[PDB]
A and B are shown apart, each in its own frame.
Chain A
């Protein structure tokens, strides 16, 4: 059929949250309070686009 279209490795570069799972879980409730709006924009984009390639930004 058709070629599956994948983003470049420069479309996938972002600075990573290089902390552990306990470090994430310790600040978890404050992260949900303070970082609410881009997280919810992303998860709405993720359940609506149904595609990780349309949600990269």
Chain B
């Protein structure tokens, strides 16, 4: 191969691998913040659905 080919192919490899490495570091930091705060789409453990609540007028008033 030409040294141009190896050289620019190496630059392509280094761009792809450095972008993957920065995305992995961002993935670690995103997971840390979402586990700490719970305000992301991940780590959303379920609570009780409020579509189960009966809002009908019950038998006794004080409720």
State the main secondary structure of chain B at its contact with A: loop
Residues in B whose Cβ lies below 8 Å from that of A47: 57, 61
Q: Number of contacting residues on B, CB 8 A?
A: 4
CB distance from B55 to the nearest CB of A (A): 12
Query: CB within 8 Å of B: which residues of A?
Result: 43, 46-47, 50-52
Query: CB within 8 Å of A: which residues of B?
Result: 57, 61-63
Residues in A whose Cβ lies below 8 Å from that of B63: 50
Kindly state the separation between the CA atoms of A47 and B63 in the bound complex, as whole angstroms: 9
State the main secondary structure of chain A at its contact with B: helix
Residues in B whose Cβ lies below 8 Å from that of A50: 61-63
5 CB contacts below 8 A, A to B, read A43-B61, A47-B61, A50-B61, A50-B63, A51-B62
**B57, B62, B63: residue with the most chain A Cβ atoms closer than 10 Å:** B62
